[model samples]
Target: LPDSILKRGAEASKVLEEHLERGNIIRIISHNDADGLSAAGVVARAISSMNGQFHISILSRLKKEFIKKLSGEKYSLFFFCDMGSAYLEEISRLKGDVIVADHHQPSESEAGPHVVHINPHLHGLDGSRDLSASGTAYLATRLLNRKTAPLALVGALGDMQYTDGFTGANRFIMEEAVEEGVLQVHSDLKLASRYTEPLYRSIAYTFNPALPGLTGDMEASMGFLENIGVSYGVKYPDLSPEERDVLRDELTRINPEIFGEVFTSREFRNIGDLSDIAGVLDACGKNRKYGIGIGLCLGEREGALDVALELQKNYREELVKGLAWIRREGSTTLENLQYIYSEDKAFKGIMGTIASISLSLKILDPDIPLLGLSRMDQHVKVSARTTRPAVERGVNLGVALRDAAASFGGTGGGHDIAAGAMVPYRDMESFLQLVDEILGTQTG
Candidate 1:
């Protein structure tokens, strides 16, 4: 590990160690997403193994009122995961020993000595790709026990930080996990349900290229499979060797670059692929089933895994519906960007997913980045997605939304390609206009 990351990890580990020594209780809060759940799982499992006392809470984001409420809590330590990097100033105000293990771009702040903030960007590493919150938590966990290393890989996969395969700290952690007999990596098709989902359903759920005839269209996917003489009901793991080859060939014809290396766990074959595990965790988070997600990560298999699988199924169904609606309704285009206003607040949680799928499927203008907005109570939740080309052209949705949302008395910031924000319901149109202007100048 780099000296900076290591130093921050050691500092955090020391805090936890001191609490363990005194047998004091710890409070943990993490983002309610796959990456956040994994981060919390890593730290929580590590503490449990040491017989330490702790409680965990998962949330969509770190809100100011929540921090103020925590200031009155009596916990010995407060640990945040996969979040808090961007809100160091607000987090620093909490009254307690605190450690933030996150990978989001950090804000400039002067945190007090009681706060130990660990982020990849602070060490000149790319937070977006190098590691994730779980990876950072694993760094500190290893200081307590090397056996907790595998959880880091799970965390990275949860965040989808394994771009071009794992690299940097994630690669290091992956190697350790493989040697520990917890993980197995090999070449395979990069489809959604490589081991768990039915063949046609997997094809329909595939979103990377958003296949013209199959993705999000079960009937179309079934027809394509029938045309190729493959069984629609067959699971990827149960397919005959010949059928597998035929399926692979057809997929390769659609996009030769789609197949790649994937990760599996020797210890948990029931979880199927690492990507599937990530998907399940993502489903749990998005569906407000964080407890089940945490349970699955912490080695609960029976009921928890079943619930997560059902959630994953429902999540895919929702995606299919969301994509279909986006395609059918089309989008409202502006000079610099395009957008879809989903009047249903239920779709708000998955707006980012819808935008990405719509953009990839060419349901919307691919050249122009699209925004998905939904009314949520008193505000509108905004999710923005764009292609790698748009990002290369310097269209940073994160920076654009951060500035625009702040002006509207809301908050937002994320990665360059995918970002999110919240704006007052009254200022929704103005926020969109501001984002359009910012994106215009950026792309120009």
Candidate 2:
């Protein structure tokens, strides 16, 4: 049964099912993010439940060198989740069957016959807003009608494909997961890490709308809790009704959208709900703890939610470090943009998250778009973001960064509001100038 929302869903499913039946060792290469990790978890769970064999690899990106190395592998089937559409030409060099379940914008290079490329963008659907690599994989993993849509929910949330709720294919996946009894919904004060973090921590970390006067200030958040007559030590779920009322009332006063439905389930008891579950998986990926992330999904792989909680905690702490850096040394502001350039390893994987929290909470000027540039081994990774108001002002960071990156023999683009790019380390200076100029022209 092919889903109407996902393009090439039937073909990808058919290929996977055939491989499973033949007991072929299908190798999975996915983006090492919460979305990609959850995507691997969803398909791997489906395949393993059907008594299939799979070897999964989580990667930061599908580099040409890495893709060329895969040509040596003996596995006959390869599924590229979270990432693949961008590197169809490089991936075409690989031998045997290829199934790319991704939601990113595809390259203009047509996929070869061996590639079963499935992306919502191929069918005039928006990937960044509606679907993630994980949800895309779930749509393609229609193996024996499995009830594994919960991980899809985790991936979608991990991708931040919602304000108060999801839309597009993510909405469809969420509804199906609920109908199948794999997930439950309960409305609560949506915090940064609601299930794991204490009340003050969650309050201090909420980035959706960036709680003013609270975000990035742990002591202030604790003081706000004290003022509200609620204990800051406990998680939001454990607060008594009276305490919850006072806290929710005050928090809602700051941002009415904070109180809303959160995705939950009877499964993954200590792991919290989809939000924190997504957090832990993302934390694992950002921290290079891929096995633990997969393990969380492999039942996943022993349900080491405790270990995952530690990773999640450490991940945010690093993000705090990044944010604090921005606070200490403000971004280099151009005529049209402002950005933080860090060669620090702690800022490498999570710069985008840092940028989002900074701009949202007004740590940086929210009027202008924000870019987080971290020095990778050979290149500078650029993560840029802007607000809806900025978008309405006709500022397209995707166009700004993509065109800037392309001029310097690099690549970048995502959505109008948020995007990423990579340029050579040498071109960092000129690249920023070009982006600043392009963004300047984009505005009214």
Candidate 3:
């Protein structure tokens, strides 16, 4: 809603127009997540509609060597989506025009004239809860005349920024999306991938105030549904209207917070709307199917949506496996944090989401932070999450992971309640200890 935020998009659009007029193809680098992919898709989709050319790479994170390698690339125009805030110094050192559309905490260091940095944080907005990269990228789309603004809303949902309703820039984007007939919003039962996922898993996967006696426990979830006269093992789409009403009433009785605004898009209807597309994109991303994720977002239906739907199921089942592992093998409690260390890289991708879900399901202690550490090549990938109560009590995982990992010769940073890190494999113990010590100081 602020002038500068809108102005920055206008500014970025101006730069993009200049490059387009000069017949320069765009180069894009983005994080490999639903939000990042959505951000990339927003820009890519807009450019492609204008008959422009672009090449993109989806990365897990920005590494020093990766940025160093990019410095020598012949590309003249680069767009960084979902990430790049922390790497401004390295990115600024490049030889071409750079546009960063992100929502992360910004680097205080000044960037060179060749870089145009646009982030919600620069405008005193809460990047975590208010807006996401796709939402920021929508600003660029606005000036370019793209009808599928719903992609930005999908990005917001990907970041878990939809609480009761969107706020700040997301709300602005949401309004325009609706007006364009690409997005429609209405309230509904809050279950994860209800139409696509089985009813039991949908109930079990509700993380927002994780359903009592059901969440994280498929047996209980199925039992509850059958007992209430609703069919077990059925998707939400299969249920009759009366059956749906009964199910909804009973769930609302358990927790009223599970009902809220549901945003659906006409353009993405076959893919199951915004939330479902977010799940699909997230699944494609985490499963290393970046091409499928982008393809589906770009309105490619032939081979993209089917594979993404399958990946969605695989991704959720994999998450259940990781959550089951954490439930079975308890965490090692430190002074200020409880952590799960896994040597399996297969579990690493879902560990962060698992950590957040574990806390919501109370599988891990909500009073302290839950850290998921897994082996990744020669480094240890760490994902940290905490409850709102813990955050209110003075826990900033972003700051803790960034500072502690830096001390251990690694890279890290994200939101306050959720963050990630990577350190040398052999130094993981010291990194954890340092993070625990930092958290200890943060809590009090």
List where candidate 2 sits over 4 angstroms from the true fold.
1-7, 143-145, 192-196, 301-303
Better of 1 and 3 by TM-score: 3
Q: What is the C-alpha RMSD of each candidate to the true structure, in Å?
A: 1.8, 2.3, 1.7
- In order of TM-score, best first, we have 3, 1, 2
Task: Estimate, for each residue in 13-75, the C-alpha lDDT of model 3 and write its tens digit.
Answer: 989988888888899899888899989999889888888999999999888789899999888
Which digits, one per residue and each the tens of the lDDT, describe model 2 over residues 1-444? 135544477788888888888877989999887889989988888887888889988887677788889989889899999887878888887879999998876777868888888788877777867888888888888545557788887888777787777888888888888888877888877787766678899887676646888877788899989887899999887888999889878988988888898788777666776877887887898888888888888765354766787777788788767777888998888898898888888777899888887887788998889889989878999999888888888898766777889898787876777888999998888898888888878884
Encode model 1's per-residue lDDT on 1-444: one tens digit a residue.
688788889989998999889888889999877788888888988898899878898888777888888888888699999888888898888777999998878889898779988888888887767788888998877777666566667677665566557888888788888887777788878788666778898889887545766789999999999999989998887888999899889988887656777777765577777767777787888888877988887788887677788889988889899988887889998888998987775675788877877887788877788889988877788888888788889899888999989997788988887788988888988888999999999988
Which has the higher TM-score value, candidate number 2 or candidate number 3? 3
Q: How far is candidate 2 from the true structure (C-alpha RMSD, Å)?
A: 2.3
> Candidate 1, after superposition: displacement of residue 17 in Å?
1.5
Residue range with the least summed lDDT across 10 consecutive positions in model 3: 204-213
**Order the candidates by lDDT, highest first — what do you get?**
3, 1, 2
What Cα-based lDDT does every candidate model obtain?
Answer: 0.82, 0.82, 0.85
lDDT, model 2? 0.82
